[PDB]
C-alpha cells in the first residue's frame, strides 16, 4: 500500500508515534518519506552484507526482524520480516518503536541524518489535522 501523506500522518498519531521517545510526528513522516516513499511493500537488498530492508520504515533484517537468510542476524522485534510488508502498519510501528528504544534513537537510520536532521520538517505533517 502507498499511503497518502495526511492519511499516514493521522494513522501514526493514532498509533502513538507523536513524541515517542522524544521524536515528533513530522520526523517520523520525514523518515517514511525518504525510506520508502510511504510504500509498505518496499524492500531493498543490500548486496554488501546480505541483509534486506523491509517496509515503510525500511527496517533491517540483521537486527530487527527474521527472514532466515541474513547471516548472523538477530530478531529484536520478534517478528518475521513478512509482517513488515503488510498494508496494516501496526507491526511495523511496534517494531519502529523498538528500534528507537536503543541509544541511537532516530539516528539509527542514516537517511534521517542525511535528509531530516537539522532541517525544517514541518512540511511533512502540515495541514493534516494532527
Spatial CA neighbour of 31 closest among 119, 91, 127, 128 = 119
DSSP letter at 71 equals T
Q: Resolution reached, in Å? A: 1.8
> Cell numbers of 97, please?
518503536
Please, are residues 44 and 33 in contact by the beta-carbon 8 Å criterion? Answer: no
Residue 78 CB partners (closer than 8 Å, separation 6+): none
Please give the domain boundaries of the chain with CATH numbers for all domains: 1-130 (1.10.530.10)
Active-site residues, by number, are 35, 53
> Cell numbers of 99, please?
528500534
Q: Which long-range contacts (CB under 8 A, 24 or more apart) does 10-13 make?
A: 10/128, 10/129, 10/130, 11/89, 12/93, 12/130, 13/130
Q: Which residues sit opposite 66 in a β-bridge?
A: 80
| Cα-to-chain-centroid distance, residue 101 | 13
Q: Which residues sit opposite 56 in a β-bridge?
A: none
Please, are residues 26 and 124 in contact by the beta-carbon 8 Å criterion? Answer: yes
Q: In what order do the strands lie in the sheet with 51-54?
A: 43-46, 51-54, 59-60
Please, are residues 18 and 12 in contact by the beta-carbon 8 Å criterion? Answer: yes
Task: Return d(Cα 53, Cα 73) in angstroms, integer.
Answer: 13
Q: Which residues sit opposite 52 in a β-bridge?
A: 45
Please, are residues 86 and 68 in contact by the beta-carbon 8 Å criterion? Answer: no
Amino acid at each position: 500500500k502507498v499511503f497518502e501523506r495526511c492519511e499516514l500522518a493521522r494513522t501514526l498519531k493514532r498509533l502513538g508515534m507523536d513524541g515517542y521517545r522524544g521524536i515528533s510526528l513530522a520526523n517520523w513522516m520525514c523518515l517514511a518519506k525518504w525510506e520508502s516513499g510511504y510504500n509498505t511493500r518496499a524492500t531493498n537488498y543490500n548486496a554488501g552484507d546480505r541483509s534486506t530492508d523491509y517496509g515503510i520504515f525500511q527496517i533491517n533484517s540483521r537486527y530487527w526482524c527474521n527472514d532466515g537468510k541474513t547471516p548472523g542476524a538477530v530478531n529484536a522485534c520478534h517478528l518475521s520480516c513478512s509482517a513488515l510488508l503488510q498494508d496494516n502498519i501496526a507491526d511495523a510501528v511496534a517494531c519502529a518503536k523498538r528500534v528507537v528504544r536503543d541509544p541511537q534513537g532516530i539516528r539509527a537510520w542514516v537517511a534521517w541524518r542525511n535528509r531530516c536532521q537539522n532541517r525544517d520538517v514541518r512540511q511533512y505533517a502540515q495541514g493534516c489535522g494532527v
